[PDB]
């Protein structure tokens, strides 16, 4: 997360850390949608162009964390993966269309002050909250700057980061990039003439873009950090997997087997 | 009261009978005592049933009282902590059916040389087991099966030569493993399994670095940041990791996390990573 | 049919459940009003 701030404790109880077993490293963000289901970005697991292909046995999931590297005693919970489900039509070849994957925990996890699931939007909620100008929230332990090129400042945070960003109208999203956009994604971030800054960055994928419903006071996950070009660059916007549009595939795997 | 000190607050009673040359529990103490300190006495023999009353007792300290025989009789359904360290026990007491709500057991620095068959049977709530400073040579298979909730295991300063390949099976919450200052030369196949171990102490052992020290070889590699050197208490072993503390043959300059298996079978299975370069940069 | 967690989803133990608001959730709510 670039130009965001340290999150308050328990501010994003659904935040999930995808951890690689060997070597040990944080590879992506994710979100808890139930006591046994985790949602993330497909390319965090499978991205053939970089020879990336992670299996259930290669990862662990860390839930309830705040610090990026410190083990958090009786606060975080570490779970194993029973099964990984990547959208069958995930397009890794050109634009990461349908950048989504579900992860089934081996055992259900107990909730606490630090561990609680986020809601998935319904028809009315989606149609109501997804409007240009409306602000959502993105969280993550990803890079604080572009790290592939010399730059001042630390690369990653010691604590979970948060930033609030405005949803952007499709035409503006489309003409800001040469990459082909689909209805299965949306972009957010401040325009060149708004002043404020902020964006997701490498390491933040899988992380959730959430919005609070003024109606029932619940938090819903509208997006999944998917991609961008550079981080927080003027005239550029971060792109997110449109969760609601993939709702049917999500329900189908979630309710597929008994339990 | 006339013998020990008594205090209350939060509603819990805490009696302190330390260093009072006692050979048995003093004359009737508060029936609502929660904490009982019987340290440094002369309890060569002690009967648990003698505490049967005081049904609100949760913490019992019988350390440094040269106990060689603990009579496990009655029950203490609310006893959570039990310190039996620095005594003369030669056989581990079977506290299963007697102490069901026990979560912390310390039988450190005694005279144990081996552990019973169903040693921990019935202690499903156990979170911390301390057996440091004894003379165990081998641990029995399934020792921690009855304690799936274990978070800490201390087996330091014993006479262990080899660990049961499946010792850590289960243990979904194990975060601390102390095996320093033993007689270990190698680590079984998948001893550490898939679980993440935040704090491990493996120094002070004569690791024989050959071809079957490779599993442990890579594990150390992956867990380089989770290996620490025990110093003492209050230090909080969360200060500066130190994987190099694990040396071949306990031979200083021969860290195990830097031992090329030269002419060892399968050129790609144990320690076959370290493929790419990384350049991390976090802050305070 | 059963997921185990919803119906309670989106309500944070340290915030909504304690009638406490975080430091910037107000920024989100204010964006729901026509900014002209
Ligand atoms: C991402 O990486 C994964 C592993 O990191 C890939 O999965 C692995 O694929 C290989 C094939 O290249 C699998 O090979 C072995 O299994 C197949 C059978 O496959 C099916 O059954 C397996 C269980 O037995 C499952 O694990 C598979 O998913 C699948 O359902 C066997 O046919 C192979 O046998 C061959 O080799 C043996 C000697 O080793 C010979 O004796 C045989 O005659 C034959 O030649 C293998 O035993 C491997 O099991 C599989 N592992 C996993 C975890 O799935 C995955 O494909 C990749 N994904 C992408 C998109 O690239
Ligand atoms: C265990 O090791 C100690 C320390 O060297 C030694 O004195 C003792 O004899 C050993 N115990 C046994 C049973 O061999
Ligand atoms: Cl990345």
Q: Which residues of A are catalytic?
A: 43, 99, 205
CA distance B69 to B52: 18
Q: Which resolution, in Å, applies to this structure?
A: 2.3
Between the CA of B135 and the centroid of ligand 2 the distance, in Å, is 7
Tokens of B64: 């440094």
**For residue B128, what are the β-bridge partners?**
B104, B152
Residue with tokens 């023999």: B45
Q: Does B196 touch chain A (CB under 8 A)?
A: yes
Identify the three-state secondary structure at position A174: helix
CA distance B132 to B106: 9
CA torsion sign for B121, B122, B127, B130 is: negative
DSSP A43: G
**For residue A223, what are the β-bridge partners?**
A209, A242
CA distance B82 to B39: 12
Determine the distance from the C-alpha atom of residue A249 to the mean position of all C-alpha atoms in its chain, rounded to a whole number: 18
Comparing CA positions, the residue from A87, A34, A35, A84 lying closest to residue A59 is A84
CA distance A191 to A186: 15
Ligand 2: nearest atom to the Cα of B113: 13
**Cis, bond preceding A23 (omega within 30 deg of 0):** yes
Mutation target for A interface from C5, C23, C27, C34: give the one with most A CBs within 10 A.
Answer: C5
Tokens of C9: 């989803």
Half-sphere exposure of residue B274, counting CA atoms within 13 Å on the CB side? 16
- Ligand 2, pocket residues at CB < 6 Å: B 113, 135, 159
- For A37, the enclosing helix (H) or strand (E) is strand A37-40
CA distance B214 to B216: 5
Tokens of C34: 């026509």
Q: Kindly write down the DSSP assignment for every residue of B195-224, as one continuous string.
A: ---SEEE--SS-B--SSTTHHHHHHHHHTG
Ligand nearest to the CA of B112: 2
Task: Work out how many domains chain B is built from and give that number.
Answer: 1
Neighbour count for residue B254 (Cβ, 10 Å): 15
Domains of chain A: residue spans and CATH: 1-12+118-244 (2.40.10.10), 13-117+245-257 (2.40.10.10)
CA distance A118 to A32: 6
Contact A229, A173 (CB under 8 A): no
C-alpha distances out from residue B236 to A46, B133, B241, Å: 39, 20, 12
DSSP A250: H
CA distance B218 to A106: 25
B93 phi, psi to nearest 5 deg: -70, 135
Nearest by CB to C25, from A35, A120, A212: name it: A212
State whether B222 and A22 contact (CB < 8 Å): yes
CA distance B88 to B46: 12
Listed by the residue before each break, gaps in chain A with C–N over 2.5 Å are: none
Rg value, chain B, Cα? 22
CA dihedral of residues A182, A186, A191, A195 (deg, nearest 10): -160
Tell me the CATH number at B48: 3.80.10.10
- In chain B, which residues have their Cβ closer than 8 Å to the Cβ of A159? none
Identify the three-state secondary structure at position A5: strand
Determine the distance from the C-alpha atom of residue B213 to the mean position of all C-alpha atoms in its chain, rounded to a whole number: 24
CA dihedral of residues B50, B52, B55, B59 (deg, nearest 10): 50
- In chain A, which residues have their Cβ closer than 8 Å to the Cβ of B225? 24
Contact B256, B209 (CB under 8 A): yes
**What is the domain extent for residue B159?**
1-284
Determine the distance from the C-alpha atom of residue B116 to the mean position of all C-alpha atoms in its chain, rounded to a whole number: 16
CA distance C35 to A133: 8
Could you tell me which chain A residue has the CA closest to the CA of B238? A70
CA angle B71, B77, B79 (to 5 degrees): 75
A·C CB contacts under 8 A: 89
Q: Kindly write down the DSSP assignment for every residue of B58-120, as one continuous string.
A: -EEE-TTS--SEEE--S--TT--EEE--SS--SS----TTT-TT--EEE--SS--SS--TTTT
- Burial class from Cβ neighbours inside 10 Å (0-12, 13-18, 19+) for residue A46 reads middle
Nearest by CB to A10, from C10, C14, C23: name it: C14
Q: Kindly write down the DSSP assignment for every residue of C1-35, as one continuous string.
A: ---SSTTSTT--TTTGGGT---TTHHHHHHTTS--
CA distance A28 to A237: 19
C-alpha distances out from residue B193 to B62, B143, B213, B271, Å: 36, 16, 15, 15
Contact A86, A45 (CB under 8 A): yes
Identify the three-state secondary structure at position A171: helix
Contact A141, A26 (CB under 8 A): yes
Identify the three-state secondary structure at position A255: coil
CA distance B44 to chain A (A): 37
Residue A232 neighbours by CB under 8 Å, 6+ apart: A2, A3, A189, A197, A198, A199, A201
Instruction: Tell me the residue length of chain A.
Output: 259
What is the third-level CATH fold of C1-36?
Epsilon-Thrombin; Chain L (4.10.140)
Ligand nearest to the CA of B135: 2
Between the CA of A43 and the centroid of ligand 1 the distance, in Å, is 21
- Burial class from Cβ neighbours inside 10 Å (0-12, 13-18, 19+) for residue A209 reads buried
Neighbour count for residue B237 (Cβ, 10 Å): 18
Contact B242, B227 (CB under 8 A): yes
């Amino acid at each position: 997360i670039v130009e965001g701030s340290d999150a308050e404790i328990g501010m994003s109880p659904w935040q999930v850390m995808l951890f690689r077993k060997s070597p040990q490293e944080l590879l992506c963000g994710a979100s808890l949608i139930s006591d046994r289901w985790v949602l993330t970005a497909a390319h965090c697991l499978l991205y053939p162009p970089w020879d990336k292909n992670f299996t259930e046995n290669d990862l662990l999931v860390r839930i309830g964390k705040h610090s990026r590297t410190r083990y958090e005693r009786n606060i975080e919970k570490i779970s194993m993966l029973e099964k990984i489900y990547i959208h069958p039509r995930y397009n890794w070849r050109e634009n990461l269309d349908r950048d989504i994957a579900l992860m089934k925990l081996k055992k259900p996890v107990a909730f606490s002050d630090y561990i609680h699931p986020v809601c998935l939007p319904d028809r009315e909620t989606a149609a109501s909250l997804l409007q240009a100008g409306y602000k959502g929230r993105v969280t993550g332990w990803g890079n604080l700057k572009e790290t592939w090129t010399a730059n001042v400042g630390k690369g990653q945070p010691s604590v979970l980061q948060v930033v609030n960003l405005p949803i952007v109208e499709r035409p503006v999203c489309k003409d800001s990039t040469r990459i082909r956009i689909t209805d299965n994604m949306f972009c957010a971030g401040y325009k060149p003439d708004e002043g404020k800054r902020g964006d997701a960055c490498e390491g933040d994928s899988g992380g959730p873009f959430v919005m609070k419903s003024p109606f029932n006071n619940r938090w819903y996950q509208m997006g999944i950090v998917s991609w961008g070009e550079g981080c927080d660059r003027d005239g550029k916007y971060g792109f997110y997997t449109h969760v609601f549009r993939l709702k049917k595939w999500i329900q189908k795997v979630i309710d597929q087997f008994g339990e | 009261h006339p013998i020990c000190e008594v205090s209350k607050v939060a509603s819990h009673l805490e009696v302190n009978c330390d260093k009072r040359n006692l050979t048995a529990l003093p004359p009737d103490l508060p029936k609502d005592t929660t904490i009982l300190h019987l340290s440094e006495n002369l309890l060569y023999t002690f009967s648990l049933a003698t505490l049967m009353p005081y049904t609100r007792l949760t913490q019992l300290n019988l350390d440094r009282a040269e106990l060689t025989k603990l009579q496990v009789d009655g029950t203490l359904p609310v006893l959570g902590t039990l310190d039996l360290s620095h005594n003369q026990l030669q056989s581990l007491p079977l506290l299963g059916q007697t102490l069901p709500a026990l979560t912390v057991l310390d039988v450190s620095f005694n005279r144990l040389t081996s552990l019973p068959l169903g040693a921990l049977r019935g202690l499903g709530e156990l979170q911390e087991l301390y057996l440091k400073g004894n003379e165990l040579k081998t641990l029995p298979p399934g020792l921690l099966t009855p304690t799936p909730k274990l978070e800490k295991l201390s087996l330091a300063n014993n006479n262990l030569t080899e660990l049961p390949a499946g010792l850590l099976n289960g243990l979904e919450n194990l975060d601390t493993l102390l095996l320093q200052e033993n007689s270990l030369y190698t680590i079984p196949k998948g001893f550490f399994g898939s679980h993440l171990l935040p704090f491990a102490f493996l120094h002070g052992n004569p690791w024989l670095c050959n071809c079957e020290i490779l599993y442990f070889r890579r594990w150390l590699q992956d867990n380089a940041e989770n290996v620490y050197v025990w110093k003492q208490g209050v230090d909080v072993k969360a200060m500066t990791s130190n994987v190099a503390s694990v040396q071949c043959d306990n031979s200083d300059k021969f860290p195990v996390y830097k031992y090329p298996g030269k002419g060892c079978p399968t050129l790609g299975d144990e320690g076959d990573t370290d493929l790419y370069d990384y350049y991390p940069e976090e802050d305070t | 049919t059963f997921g185990s967690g919803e119906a309670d989803c989106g309500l944070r133990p340290l915030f909504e459940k304690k009638s406490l608001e975080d430091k910037t959730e107000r920024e989100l709510l204010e964006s729901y009003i026509d900014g002209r």
